[PDB]
Amino acid sequence: SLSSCSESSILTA
Amino acid sequence: SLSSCSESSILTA
Amino acid sequence: VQLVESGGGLVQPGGSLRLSCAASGFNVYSSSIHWVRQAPGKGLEWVASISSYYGYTYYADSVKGRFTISADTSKNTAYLQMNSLRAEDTAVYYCARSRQFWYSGLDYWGQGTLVTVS
Amino acid sequence: VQLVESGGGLVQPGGSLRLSCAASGFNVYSSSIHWVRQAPGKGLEWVASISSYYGYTYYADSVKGRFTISADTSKNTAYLQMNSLRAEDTAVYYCARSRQFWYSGLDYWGQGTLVTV
Amino acid sequence: PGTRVFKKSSPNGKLTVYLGKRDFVDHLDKVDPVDGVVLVDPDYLKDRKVFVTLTVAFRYGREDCDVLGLSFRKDLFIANYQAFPPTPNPPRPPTRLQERLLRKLGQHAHPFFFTIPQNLPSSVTLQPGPEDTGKALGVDFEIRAFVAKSLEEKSHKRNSVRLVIRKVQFAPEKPGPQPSAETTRHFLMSDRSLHLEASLDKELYYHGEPLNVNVHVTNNSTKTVKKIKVSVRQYADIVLFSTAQYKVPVAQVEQDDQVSPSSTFSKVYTITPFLANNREKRGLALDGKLKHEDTNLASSTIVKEGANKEVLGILVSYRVKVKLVVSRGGDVSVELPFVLMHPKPHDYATDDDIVFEDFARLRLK
Amino acid sequence: PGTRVFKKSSPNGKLTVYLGKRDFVDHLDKVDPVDGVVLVDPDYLKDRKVFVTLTVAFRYGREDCDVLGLSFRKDLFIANYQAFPPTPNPPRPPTRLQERLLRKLGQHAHPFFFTIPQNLPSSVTLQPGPEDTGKALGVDFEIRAFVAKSLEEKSHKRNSVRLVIRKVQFAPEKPGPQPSAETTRHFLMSDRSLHLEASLDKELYYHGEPLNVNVHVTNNSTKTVKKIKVSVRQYADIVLFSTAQYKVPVAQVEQDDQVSPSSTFSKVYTITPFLANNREKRGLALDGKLKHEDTNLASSTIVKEGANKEVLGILVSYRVKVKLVVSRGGDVSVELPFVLMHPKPHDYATDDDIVFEDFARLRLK
Amino acid sequence: SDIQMTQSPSSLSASVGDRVTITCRASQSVSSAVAWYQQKPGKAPKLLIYSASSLYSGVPSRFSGSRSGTDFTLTISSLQPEDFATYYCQQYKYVPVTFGQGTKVEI
Amino acid sequence: SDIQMTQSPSSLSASVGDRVTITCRASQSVSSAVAWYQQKPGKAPKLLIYSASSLYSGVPSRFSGSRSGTDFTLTISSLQPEDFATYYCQQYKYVPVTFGQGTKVEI
């Protein structure tokens, strides 16, 4: 598997 | 809540 | 090994009674002495406990603050000081002894002293 | 700023060709030099990359072991040594330059040297 | 008929360790082997192997995050076992407990087996100081289980499961020799000589059991003895690469029993070590804990008659001290060693290590 | 255009922290404030308040359990903020980014705000040596979020979420004075005096940009100069409670340019610091990391004109050294300071601390 | 909260040579830390079982306890005329220790 | 594994004054680390977009990129006669860097 790491999201006006 | 701790189980012949 | 106790009797409501439990045959640092009362016509109930090896004392929520337990380690005796005896405190109080290392039930009991209020 | 490259041509199959890429206008430690080949009538493909600031080199799986990339830091040039040129290695090889701090695409390219087997 | 078995699960839930016991008794000739069962789903590690490790470590500081000189960790013994895929048959075919656990759990169970060596120390914990914001140094036993492609692979917090065990000793059946000692302190020219004798009633005492010392003083000289002071000392010997001994008094009894010149004296004192009046003392040795349960004073560490090297970890010992206080000097004392244990139930030279040794020598004294 | 936002979730999957940035730039007069959003479900907490903490800590050793002299941790700055229940209005109403995040996430969002102080050091990391089994000392910034009944309550691994940030600086817009130096070394009685002059072409150099030194030698004396050796030195000044300075050479250029007596000499050397041939050196300072990715050599720690205290963490500086080698002694040298930085983008006296200071002084030297 | 211990049946009648089983329901999943006491009318209680299965020394072998999850049961193999008294089920895993409401064995 | 980058449509025709939009499907959830290149027939490629939205210096403003999850799109607001060439979609988040199969804009 993999390790719970950081991630990203999108933001709009 | 409570945290993940050690527990027990039963064993028979 | 005996747990002879004394001090019970009749006390006016709001007064004070002091129970003494004089142990023999064992030591106060290898055992913890508990007090259990039997309400008239009702099952047993735990009230106090003292552990002279660690120095901890415990009380029931219904007797907390009113009851103070202490032991005289030189005389191998335990004392229960009761303050402001209410109407519901009447019972027969048993002095019990349980092993310190480790707890395996109240294997030795006293003989009971009747406490009454009016 | 130009990426002059040479060394391409015709090589017998199973032989070796040496591509040299001579840069100017920038430095070899502030940039990483990549090699990209364009198969005839087919899209681009990345083959090698060298980072002279860190000392790492990378190769594609299809050219790994056969290709060795190195740079002469004093001459500000990069070299690609291709060994055992198989039939599928024919393409036009572009010398590309990308920023080291930090990577923002291959903003400078060479002019392409044809390689045939 | 029924028996209890201990169980802990991985945070992800796909890995579980079964242990028949948590406290393993040492018999001074053999140690109870650590035999257990590992439950795992083969599809979970589609290609990773399963390893379990038994580790004993000299540690310091708390367990999570100290803003201090955090844990100096020095493993004293390391063992590795591959639960899945199975290893060769030895040591032995699976034992009765392992067989019963496998029957209970089915084919999804895998046994693991560790034999603790004889010379490893017991589990003890030094009492933290009232000023420090974290627990003090101590040695403990611990078991881990994880799945990884290789032993050198990094740890996985979400996958591995960590379980704590203990190593304990119990009082030997046979009695020991009666502890007794004597000492004489004669004056300048007189054949008269101050002489005291102290002795115990047994050599082994249970926890909370009182100690009787029979002090016998023969002061035929011309000086007067003012007091007799009796103390019980705990000796915590720490051996990492150098040997450091620390003494902690745990009980004192003093009575103003003056002795007249040219006359004898005899008394039988009573003393009892306990933890009630020792919670503020730094460097007091206590028995190992599972989580944070209360523990008595550390039991004495005894070594077999063939005590060849055995010097790792923390070693605890007790001694009763009798001292006579005399006017204008003339102090005379004797010491009576004894062992304190529970009855048996019946149902390198790395730089940082030298730095830590210096730090511990500074801190404890 | 779209805006990217960084987020991380608690292992239990409830607590989540949103951050608009990971690298916060210092402008030598103000620091970019740390503004974020904490998402939580109020039913999951029942009476457990939500706290977020920003911490910068001087560390040692790896993140996991090291069998060594593990992390000496000393928090240089601590801040506490209560996300839920809401805190009073200041500092200011929620900013534009916070408003947008709350609009995106709804009423489950809660803003938190931290103003990093100006005197805090940047994020740097000392390079571990090949002999160590773990990463070396360094200073880093970190953010935590957790739910608890009180601040003094112990942390929970399953509930808390931990996130790493960095503090960075960029090259100032204005240029600096020309770095130049001179030195004379005259002989016993001759008015003739050995004279060398070295200078740089600029005062600020970008990472990977070469350095030009215009060494000018005026040796009117009767002795012969054998070689000129030019070096670039990195100065890592560690300040915990005493200022310990360590020097590391990162680049050297040597040419056999002998100088005849009573004659001048002039040359323009070239030198470039880089990390390719510096991976075996212990104590080399590198820029901070969010993960185990590669980073360049540590940028110089510029200090504003109002250098009041500013002494914490690791402070990095660079100097170019020019040295003339003369037969039978007579060494003469000059040093040219410079600053190395990235261009601006367009888009307590506790004993263990003294012990660790001694340990670091011993190990690094 | 305080762990209440429910003990049933409250009252029963038996005969010499019969089997008697007393159930004891724990409100929370305690360990085998349950003890059984006997009390004749007028006397002090008397320990019979500890650790929910271990027989106290001096107690006749006809007394036998057991555990099934949180169900603790006291079993008498063959009732004797001495066993007519009140039996209490006590848990001592968590402070405060709580006693059952009591069960009296009668002719 | 190697992150394949699917670029569609492969071939298209347009007119001066029309809009052209080229999609680019990433097989794995890379970040905005995607760059767009242009190559005329016979010349070397030319960087247009980096970070999937930032416009390269000197590129006319009619070129504009975008990101939608893993969908990267190149948009031309008003096609000029200089835009007839082949456009490539490259990801550089993970080594090896992979190029799209190419799209040619024609009259």
XYZ file of C-alpha atoms in Angstrom, chain B:
13
model
C -13.253 8.266 23.346
C -10.656 5.575 24.237
C -7.479 4.617 22.392
C -6.292 1.379 20.789
C -5.141 -0.822 23.668
C -4.319 -4.475 24.323
C -7.227 -6.882 24.761
C -7.931 -10.522 25.584
C -9.589 -13.642 24.194
C -10.602 -17.112 25.367
C -8.913 -20.429 24.604
C -10.210 -23.941 25.268
C -8.862 -27.493 25.055
